[PDB]
Amino acid sequence: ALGKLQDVVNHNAQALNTLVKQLSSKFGAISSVLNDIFSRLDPPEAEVQ
Amino acid sequence: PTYGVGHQPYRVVVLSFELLHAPATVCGPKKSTNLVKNKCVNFNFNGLKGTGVLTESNKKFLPFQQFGRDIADTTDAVRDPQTLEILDITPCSFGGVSV
Amino acid sequence: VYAWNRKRISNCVADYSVLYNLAPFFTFKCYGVSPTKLNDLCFTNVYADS
Amino acid sequence: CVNLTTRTQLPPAYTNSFTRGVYYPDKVFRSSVLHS
Amino acid sequence: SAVQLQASGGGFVQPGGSLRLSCAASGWAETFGHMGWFRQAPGKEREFVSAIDWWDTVHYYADSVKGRFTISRDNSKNTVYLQMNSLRAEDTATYYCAYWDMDYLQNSIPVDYWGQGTQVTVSS
Ligand SMILES: *[C@@H]1O[C@H](CO)[C@@H](O)[C@H](O)[C@H]1NC(C)=O
Ligand SMILES: *[C@@H]1O[C@H](CO)[C@@H](O)[C@H](O)[C@H]1NC(C)=O
Numbered sequence: 001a002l003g004k005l006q007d008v009v010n011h012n013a014q015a016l017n018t019l020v021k022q023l024s025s026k027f028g029a030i031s032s033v034l035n036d037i038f039s040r041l042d043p044p045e046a047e048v049q
Numbered sequence: 050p051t052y053g054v055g056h057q058p059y060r061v062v063v064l065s066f067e068l069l070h071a072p073a074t075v076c077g078p079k080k081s082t083n084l085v086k087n088k089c090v091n092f093n094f095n096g097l098k099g100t101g102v103l104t105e106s107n108k109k110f111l112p113f114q115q116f117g118r119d120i121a122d123t124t125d126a127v128r129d130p131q132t133l134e135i136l137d138i139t140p141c142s143f144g145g146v147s148v
Numbered sequence: 149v150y151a152w153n154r155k156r157i158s159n160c161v162a163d164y165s166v167l168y169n170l171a172p173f174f175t176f177k178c179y180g181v182s183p184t185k186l187n188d189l190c191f192t193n194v195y196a197d198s
Numbered sequence: 199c200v201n202l203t204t205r206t207q208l209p210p211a212y213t214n215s216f217t218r219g220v221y222y223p224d225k226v227f228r229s230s231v232l233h234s
Numbered sequence: 235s236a237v238q239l240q241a242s243g244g245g246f247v248q249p250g251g252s253l254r255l256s257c258a259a260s261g262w263a264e265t266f267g268h269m270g271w272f273r274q275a276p277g278k279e280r281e282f283v284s285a286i287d288w289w290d291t292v293h294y295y296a297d298s299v300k301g302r303f304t305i306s307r308d309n310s311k312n313t314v315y316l317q318m319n320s321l322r323a324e325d326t327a328t329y330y331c332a333y334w335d336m337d338y339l340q341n342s343i344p345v346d347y348w349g350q351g352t353q354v355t356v357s358s
Binding site for chain 4: 070108110111113114115116117118120126
């Protein structure tokens with residue numbers, strides 16, 4: 001009966017969660033972590049990486 | 050020796066790296082300071098950069114596991130090489146302000 | 149080349165200033181790592197095929 | 199070496215595997231995560 | 235990469251004669267690429283003269299010096315050599331040996347390194 005109200009909560013938190021997951025996307029680079037991409041490559045190519 | 054350049058012997062060496070789930074054993078030449086906890090500091094654990102608050106942890110690492118990750122899929126647990134323990138990394142205090 | 153050797157090195161510190169003066173000219177091509185920063189890393193296992 | 203021809207020839211048997219044969223693919227540490 | 239180029243040769247000559255230039259390379263580069271010479275006339279722009287692959291397989295020459303300049307390579311010294319003849323007045327200029335660090339040459343626009351200027355003067 002209260003499903004509608006419940007829906008709102010499940011609409012927000014889950015959506016937020018998805019955003020966090022998108023933080024772990026390579027996006028075509030060589031590594032997701034920004035530190036490794038700077039401790040393993042020269043400045044001239046790290047910019048385009 | 051009278052052959053062309055495209056015939057002379059060339060010595061070739063190939064170096065292949067391995068970054069596996071184990072303490073590296075080919076770490077480069079660098080010093081090692083002491084360990085400080087419960088303070089937002091920079092750190093370098095086996096070449097891994099980052100800033101955070103090293104805190105004592107209680108998660109039971111597997112015998113051959115080296116690093117750890119979180120539900121957000123990023124580094125949050127580190128095993129210290131010299132002294133085998135488990136340390137948790139958490140960003141220090143941080144938030145927005147309003148006037 | 150048909151029976152190329154393989155050498156395993158482990159449990160040692162590796163300073164790479166040695167391999168900068170080995171010949172008047174040579175090719176140093178690295179995939180994935182830049183040579184300048186290569187000194188400041190920690191590879192877990194490194195294998196040499198000569 | 200020493201040889202031996204006391205072998206017995208039989209047709210192969212068969213049996214089910216249930217749900218065995220899962221190994222840790224990556225040995226990083228994860229807790230309460232549904233990995234794929 | 236860290237490549238150093240040492241140039242040698244040059245001076246004062248008579249028209250129609252022959253002279254001596256050679257460039258050596260040292261250090262370490264990404265790959266075994268091409269090597270060429272660049273001419274700078276006083277008051278003019280810097281233009282290429284030719285380009286030779288490292289393994290002496292294919293040669294490229296400018297239309298203005300074809301059949302008059304040639305470039306070859308050493309077999310035991312890793313030093314590129316070049317020969318010329320029938321020198322004319324316009325050849326008085328500054329020459330630089332340059333290293334191109336790619337396997338296959340497409341055009342002379344991108345130049346990696348430059349050597350010390352070698353001034354050659356021809357007159358009567
Ligand atoms: C040397 O390294 C080992 C390996 O972790 C460590 O257990 C030991 O305490 C270290 N000793 C010194 C002198 O730092
Ligand atoms: C195993 O093999 C038999 C023979 O082909 C097959 O008919 C049967 O369905 C299989 N049984 C199991 C346990 O999967």
